[PDB]
Amino acid sequence: MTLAKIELLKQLLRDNEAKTVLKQTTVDQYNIIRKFNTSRIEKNPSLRMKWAMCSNFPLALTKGDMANRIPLEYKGIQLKTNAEDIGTKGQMCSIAAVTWWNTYGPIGDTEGFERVYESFFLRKMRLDNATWGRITFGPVERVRKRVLLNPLTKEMPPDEASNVIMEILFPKEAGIPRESTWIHRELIKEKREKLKGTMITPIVLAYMLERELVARRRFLPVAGATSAEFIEMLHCLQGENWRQIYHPGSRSQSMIVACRKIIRRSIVASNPLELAVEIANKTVIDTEPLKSCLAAIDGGDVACDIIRAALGLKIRQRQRFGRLELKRISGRGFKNDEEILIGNGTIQKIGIWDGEEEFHVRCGECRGILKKSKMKLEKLLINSAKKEDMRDLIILCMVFSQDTRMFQGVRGEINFLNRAGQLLSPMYQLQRYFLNRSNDLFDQWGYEESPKASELHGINESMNASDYTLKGVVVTRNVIDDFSSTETEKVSITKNLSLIKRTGEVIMGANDVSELESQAQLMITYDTPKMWEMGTTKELVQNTYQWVLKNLVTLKAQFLLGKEDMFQWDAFEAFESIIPQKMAGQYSGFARAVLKQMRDQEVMKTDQFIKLLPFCFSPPKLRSNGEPYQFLKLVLKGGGENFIEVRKGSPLFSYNPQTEVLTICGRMMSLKGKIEDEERNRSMGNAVLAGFLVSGKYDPDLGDFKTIEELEKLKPGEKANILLYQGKPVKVVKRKRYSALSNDISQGIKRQRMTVESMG
Amino acid sequence: MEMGRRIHLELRNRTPSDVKELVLDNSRSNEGKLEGLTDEFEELEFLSTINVGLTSIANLPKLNKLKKLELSDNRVSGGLEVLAEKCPNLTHLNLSGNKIKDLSTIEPLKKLENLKSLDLFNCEVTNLNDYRENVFKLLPQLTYLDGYDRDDKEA
């Protein structure tokens, strides 16, 4: 076929038009060339299809050897014709041959469908094992929401999706893997292995992968659950006047906690942005940096939005004040400084918004419309969603509106701080005061007659659907749908993590995050010593072991040399904090002696090496004679379960060699085995053309090009002649290491700021 | 993988009398045996046989230095008296996960006097009234058991 390709190319070039266009349009311009089709689209597909199905041979068969399997006329029925074609240059055929092929003919392979169409079979599995329930014929309240129509294996932006698809099913044309294949290495290797052994046309697989990865989101009327699993069946579950019970056949909380922790860590220091981004791109959740679920979900908690702004990602431009999401509708508010006496008797100089304004307001499950004038709230319309959410909405909108009544309702004091110990602006101090004491401005706010009307009904201070409501507040028994035109407009990030509009206006403040702690439902493994000196001993041990495991190659290489520089690593200094001071030195000496014996009089043993390395950070204290002390049970801070077993394993550390697996702090990790062989198996994902850098031009000294398989044969540091993307001959050099541009940039910034401080 | 491969890897193609321990784990065996260990072995201290599918104890070099032996996850069910004639110097015995029917299977250990610890986990014999007491008075030489003779110490 390659000979047929070259012959077709020569015949095409024989014409001068082909010669001039080919030599004129670069590879990039090819797209334009392709789009110059006739565009004589059929005006009515129904009539065309109806007419074609009645024709003798409407099917357009591609020229090939398949036709010989079937006669041109079977059982006196015409199937295919040998007449030439001009539209497709193939042959003609009829649905009769298609039906015969479905009846008889070659028998193909059934394996490919088990995994290739994984999403469809997962849909069928979720349908089959689903459990149905009763039907509620009563009216259903539905809200218009931006929902993901179908579940995704790993949500990623369209460009990353395309790059991943190419890296999966297009081994060639993979020049310079970006900072996206390493993030999705597991997906790359999984899909690569699954799709290997097939014969389907590559475009079908590419489109299916695009469906399986690229997100599809739409505005839909929903009531109840919102996960894609329920959205798949929304056509049956929901109903204007009927509802059905359905149960189809995590990382979010962990990312919330991690982002909050990063925010708190970075704020306390100066220049928070650089430190925050360093920790964010140096963090990982069990297989991937934080830019694998942050980039997945749309928006999220204020901390996640601030981190995404610090990183490179798109965030919804809703104004976050405390918990309120505000979307301006009209009016311009002039922020002018003014001196106002607070109900406590003190006088504060703060910014007030002159002029009328209106905002769509959201908080948890509560939606509403707020209309406010300067120093006064005017109107508020809400729907009954939840007592807690409604109370939060009322109080937060009250504080935001800066109503004089809210100021006159203060009774305690405003001198609070955050977990980092900083004094906030009076607005957020008032927010915290009122949220802590909800029954402070509610009592003195004043009451208003109930909204006498067909549906409008009031709500009292206790959040019960009781009449004699608050002044201004109204609850309508309808559906309020808000937050249209999510433009994701351009937003800047200041050093202090506080976002601002295209203009100087501030949208998100550094203190919007709520100071609420939780437990990471996943292994939050960072890569910087500064971060993890907060949590418990178990977390410290887990993070230190993860740090050791990640960069196992470097530590193993340094082990062979046999120098103390290997042991004086900052990563273990935090570990020193969780070892008893009176006995840490003995542990260090014992472990140093054991590891010296390991290097001298035996061979590689990764498990014990990892177990014993970290304890040697502290200086040793040998026996009076000089020999090292011997132990078999390393006690840790907290006692009891916080202890390491030298021989086989313990609650915090146990490695089984029968299956060669590692369990650290109750978490199983796969140590396929030992050896650079297992190192390369770990590297079994990565990306084609990941171990080679670009240097130089064609350089014909090497003759013709060489394939990836022949490329691997070259020893490190060689020069090879390869083709990049669609052609583009270049010269490449095999890499001797693995790179991390983010680490380099972070270290450069650290050195720069160290220099700045030292000069200062 | 086979017992021979494990023997070669552990001995590293050296004289048999160079290692005092063996690790025969995850090794397929012919009809449930422990082949690959010739009778020429003279020095051995520790043993380890797990997931070997051993069904009987009838092939074992005669020894006078072994003190520990480990059998687990096997369907072996037969008299162990042969250990006395093969190596009456056992101190640690581990039968965790084995398949023993009744008390009679562990009777032949009386003639051995050096045994101090015996392990029997999730065994069909372990689910009986006064099994702990019955075994104790049946093997007076025993000084340890599944771990709770009187206290907790480690091997």
């Binding site: 109806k50 020049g175 850098l693 | -």
Partner: protein, 716 residues
């Protein structure tokens, strides 16, 4: 471009580039290419300075990451680029003094401790050598030079300053940036560090500038004048100034609308001086006579089916002496009778061919030859008698009587059912069980109404017509008007309703017309009401016994014309069924909203707790009458079927414009006090569509009657 910068660069590098631009008073937004260049410069400098350290001896070496060595860990390269200008200058001076080297006159980018030199890093889109020489000339030999280009080539003052890995990595980053820019098409738009001070160039020529000059609003004389006026002048109440002078004779004329203002639409239908509306539908609806033959169930070609159906009725098949009951106005009795005889002979012929054997008599029977011959424009210009035909407006007719009778008759149950639907998969969810129950309750009602049989007959006829037209283009064809009818006992009768000659359908376009002549069996003698049949030439071809009661049998012959559009819509007329169900579904659902359980059995037949649902369906002697749920569903289905069959431009113009009055009446019934601006305008718009469409005239009549009913009932 800024989006690419945000995506491909860290926020830190962007901040440093923005700070550098601010120091120079250069706006990053107005020069995004320059911002990208500065970001790339900072990134390459950081990439060069990373990973490189000096051992105690002073030999360059690599140091691992995340693995500190006490405090110093002295790096090989100290980055100077990115610091504030004052701080960078001071750092350069401090390094020069400390190492005893000359202070460069120009600020440096990096400093190498090993060589103890100041290194300048440059980038370019052109050849590395050219940029290297330019930078050397500008700066001199006091600073080492390292220039990298996007085409994988570089110029280094010293080849040992950077190892293979560093150059390879910087080149890989540059190539990735270039590829991403090309994919985003920013590469060509991107302009380097020598052209980024120019900006895009797009200047207007002479003709376009003149067109802009003359295309300025009144009062201006040049587009520069308009531009200055728009940019400078500020309106501060121009709208009120214009309104303060605009005449008070312009206004919406807001008038409140009451019941009395609403009057009957299209009073001319009542007038008896106008002719009775004729039957212009494609096929007979309430008069079809089904030549029914019991069949085992085998589906056969329509030609064979018609052959057999005529074979059963030998008297009508062999009838050859017609009795003209009426020749309408223009058609010729001889032509139509001979054409019908040829039709019968072709159908009854032994050969399977269903094409007319004459091919010449039909040419004049169908009037194909009675067409004008087109000439060229010149002769038409020269000739004086070649005028333009005056538009033919539709006749202004009156309310007929056959439309009401057909509306009644097509909406009644019949023992015969034809509408059958394909099976669907088993229903396992409760929701689909409820749906199946509702669907069964609906089809049990619709299937037995005659309107369903008429709809199926229309659909089958149009499907067969389309198939014949596509298969046969330039030959006259014979087409039976076939239908299949299953009785309650399961006997699958095949019904022949007549024949039709199809003319020559060789048409490239869709709007082109194709002529067909329809002969239809019927049991109705037109003399009973001759006003309904002014378009039909009929015979009396015999009589038949259905059960012992002899009834005549006539043949209605008429020439007509269709097109591919209506021809397709014939097979899409089944959607009426959907329109019949949707609304009723909603109705039922509303009931279900009231009380919790499912009512589809209650609304249809009723239960011990709820009475059967009854609508208002008809009237008699001025007394409105109720009607069961099934009867209302039948009425809606027949309304949809008529909306199809009698559909044309007039029907659309009538419905889409009388909806205004429908919504106004709905608002009035809710006491919203609707106001109107020009009522007579809406009424005229509506009534300029009631010309000759029978369904439009009957819709107007029913609208007037219902409006009278609403007026009389509004008293409460």
């Amino acid at each position: 471009m800024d989006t690419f910068i945000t995506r491909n660069f860290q926020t830190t590098i962007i901040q440093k580039a923005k700070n550098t631009m601010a120091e120079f008073s250069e706006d990053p937004e107005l020069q995004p290419a320059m911002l990208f260049n500065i970001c790339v410069h900072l990134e390459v400098c950081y990439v060069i300075s990373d990973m490189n350290f000096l051992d105690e001896e002073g030999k360059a070496y690599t140091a691992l990451e995340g693995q500190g060595k006490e405090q110093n860990l002295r790096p090989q390269y100290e980055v100077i680029e990115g610091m504030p200008r004052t701080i960078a200058w001071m750092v350069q001076r401090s390094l020069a003094q400390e190492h005893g080297i000359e202070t460069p006159k120009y600020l440096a980018d990096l400093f190498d401790y090993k060589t103890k030199r100041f290194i300048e890093v440059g980038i370019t889109k052109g050849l590395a050598d050219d940029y290297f020489w330019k930078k050397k000339e500008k700066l001199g030999n006091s600073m080492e030079l390292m220039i990298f280009s996007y085409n994988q080539d570089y110029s280094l003052s010293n080849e040992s300053s950077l190892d293979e890995e560093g150059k390879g990595r910087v080149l890989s980053r540059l190539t990735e940036l270039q590829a991403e820019l090309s994919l985003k098409n920013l590469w060509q738009v991107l302009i380097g560090e020598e052209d980024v001070e120019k900006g895009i160039d797009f200047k207007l020529g002479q003709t376009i500038s003149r067109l802009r000059d003359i295309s300025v609003p009144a009062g201006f004389s040049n587009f520069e004048g308009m531009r200055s006026y728009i940019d400078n002048i500020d309106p501060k109440g121009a709208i009120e100034r214009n309104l303060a002078r605009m005449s008070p004779l312009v206004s919406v004329t807001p008038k409140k609308l009451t019941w009395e203002d609403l009057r009957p639409i299209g009073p001319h239908i009542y007038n008896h001086e106008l002719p009775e509306v004729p039957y212009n539908a494609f096929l007979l609806m309430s008069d079809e006579l089904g030549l029914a033959n019991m069949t085992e169930g085998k589906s056969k070609k329509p030609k064979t089916l018609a052959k057999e159906c005529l074979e059963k009725y030998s008297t009508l098949r062999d009838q050859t002496d017609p009795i003209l009951i009426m020749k309408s106005e223009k058609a010729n009795e001889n032509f139509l009778w001979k054409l019908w005889r040829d039709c019968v002979n072709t159908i009854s012929n032994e050969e399977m061919s269903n094409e007319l054997q004459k091919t010449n008599y039909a040419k004049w029977a169908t009037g194909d030859g009675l067409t004008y011959q087109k000439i060229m424009k010149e002769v038409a210009i020269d000739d004086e008698t070649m005028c333009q035909e005056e538009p033919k407006i539709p006749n202004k007719c009156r309310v007929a009587a056959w439309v009401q009778t057909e509306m009644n008759l097509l909406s009644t149950l019949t023992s015969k059912r034809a509408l059958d639907l394909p099976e669907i998969g088993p229903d396992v969810a409760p929701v689909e069980h409820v749906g199946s129950e509702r669907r069964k309750y609906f089809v049990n009602e619709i299937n037995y109404c005659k309107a369903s049989t008429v709809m199926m007959k229309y659909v089958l006829f149009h499907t067969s017509l389309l198939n014949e037209s596509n298969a046969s283009m330039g030959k006259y064809k014979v087409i039976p008007i076939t239908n299949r009818v299953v009785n309650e006992k399961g006997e699958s009768f095949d019904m022949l309703y007549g024949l039709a000659v199809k003319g020559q359908s060789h048409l490239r376009g869709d709007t082109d017309v194709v002529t067909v002549v329809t002969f239809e069996f019927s049991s109705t003698d037109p003399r009973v009401d001759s006003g309904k049949w002014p378009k039909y030439t009929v015979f009396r071809i015999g009589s038949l016994f259905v059960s012992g009661r002899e009834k005549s049998v006539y043949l209605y012959c008429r020439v007509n014309g269709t097109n591919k559009i209506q021809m397709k819509w014939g097979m899409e007329a089944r959607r009426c069924l959907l329109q019949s169900m949707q609304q009723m579904e909603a109705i039922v659902e509303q009931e279900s909203s009231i009380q919790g359980y499912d009512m589809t059995k209650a609304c249809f037949k009723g239960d011990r707790v709820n009475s059967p649902k009854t609508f208002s369906i008809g009237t008699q002697e001025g007394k409105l009458v109720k009607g069961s749920f099934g009867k209302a569903l039948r009425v809606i289905f027949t309304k949809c079927l008529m909306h199809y069959v009698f559909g044309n431009a007039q029907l659309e113009g009538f419905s889409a414009e009388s909806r205004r009055l429908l919504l106004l009446i709905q608002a009035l019934k809710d006491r919203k006090g609707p106001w109107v601006f020009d009522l007579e305008g809406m009424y005229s718009g509506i009534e300029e569509c009631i010309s000759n469409n029978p369904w439009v005239i009957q819709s107007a009549y029913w609208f007037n009657e219902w409006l009278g009913f609403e007026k009389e009932g509004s008293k409460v």
